[PDB]
Design a protein around this ligand. Structure first.
Ligand code: ZSY
Length: 330
């Protein structure tokens, strides 16, 4: 089997991407944020505190003939931006782009933090990291990808995120028309439950490439590119007037600037992020100070290849017995 679904930026900055997902019988279509940095599939639901729902589409398990309460199971998650959600769990049929999993754990939110309520465009998350991070208790649950893997033609999914445009998540096959050149594959460590890999270095604009190992995660659920402070300083030093602002919470730059590209290494290959991908626009409406798309990871404890980086590539998440990641230009 295979699946193929279009993923769409939620706003004009590509702050996140939503992909439609069919849950239950008859189908209830919810727009989920596919997140390779987490491992819970959770949704706004008929159980969500009513004051915490503001325009999202909800899953109502009582209207699904295939929903079954997973008795006793609860879940609770916190994300690196401080947001969180929690609730109970049902199993139900879940389809993505024509690929169906029966008995998928669908984690129904009873509570969501303010950031979720305030984002009417995201109806939930679909976790695609390793199942060892799944928060369900007392019996940890598998991700949609783990449940589907055995049926898939090839035990892979691919992320092809667009810049200010739709893109695609595919399951079970590699679309050889979707990228240029070859795919370079690199080793993955699952020890922290993430798609954790080691970049071979970086370049700023037309500058010389610096060979240096940068350990970090491929995280579709994170907007920006978070890298060591030395790297980020070198990038922003090339932008006249850029500075790190404690009041804003990162690097800002004059909106009048033209940003340089940023290249990261994947083995001997190179992925170039165009400068325009690094512009996240005015810090507040009407400001001429713009927010940078490359920020320091020093506060986080891990480097994160988020959407800014991933949208410059066609990315293979290879869930073979020994997982690997593949990157190609496109
Ligand atoms: O939001 C998280 C994050 C945190 C915790 C968990 C997790 C799974 C299960 C329990 O906790 N999963 C994440 O997905 N980021 C992305 C991030 C962090 C900080 C700033 C920006 N982006 C990843 C790094 C851990």
């Amino acid at each position: 089997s295979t699946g193929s679904a279009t993923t769409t930026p939620i706003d004009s900055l590509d702050d996140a991407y939503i992909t439609p997902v069919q849950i239950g019988t008859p189908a209830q279509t919810l727009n989920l944020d596919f997140d390779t940095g987490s491992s819970d599939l959770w949704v706004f639901s008929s159980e969500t505190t009513a004051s915490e729902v503001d325009g999202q589409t909800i899953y109502t398990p009582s209207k699904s003939t295939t929903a079954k309460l997973l008795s006793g199971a609860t879940w609770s998650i916190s994300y690196g931006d401080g947001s969180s959600s929690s609730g109970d769990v049902y199993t139900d049929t879940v389809s993505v782009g024509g690929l169906t999993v029966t008995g998928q754990a669908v984690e129904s939110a009873k509570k969501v933090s303010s950031s979720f309520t305030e984002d009417s465009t995201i109806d939930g998350l679909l976790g695609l990291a390793f199942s060892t991070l799944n928060t369900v208790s007392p019996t940890q649950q598998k991700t949609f990808f783990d449940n589907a893997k055995a049926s898939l033609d090839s035990p892979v999914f691919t992320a092809d995120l667009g810049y200010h445009a739709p893109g695609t998540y595919n399951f079970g096959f590699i679309d050889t028309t979707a990228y240029t050149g070859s795919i370079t594959y690199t080793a993955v460590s699952t020890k922290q439950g993430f798609w954790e890999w080691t970049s071979t270095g970086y370049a700023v604009g037309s500058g010389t490439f610096k060979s240096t190992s940068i350990d970090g995660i491929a995280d579709t659920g994170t907007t920006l590119l978070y890298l060591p402070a030395t790297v980020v300083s070198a990038y922003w030093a090339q932008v006249s007037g850029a500075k790190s602002s404690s009041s804003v919470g990162g690097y800002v730059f004059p909106c009048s600037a033209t940003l340089p590209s940023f290249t990261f290494g994947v083995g001997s290959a190179r992925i170039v992020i165009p400068g325009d991908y690094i512009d996240f626009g005015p810090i507040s409406t009407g400001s001429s100070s713009c927010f940078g798309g490359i920020q320091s990871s020093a506060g986080i404890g891990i480097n994160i290849f988020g959407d800014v980086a991933l949208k410059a590539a066609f990315v293979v998440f290879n869930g073979a017995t020994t997982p690997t990641l593949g990157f190609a230009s496109k």
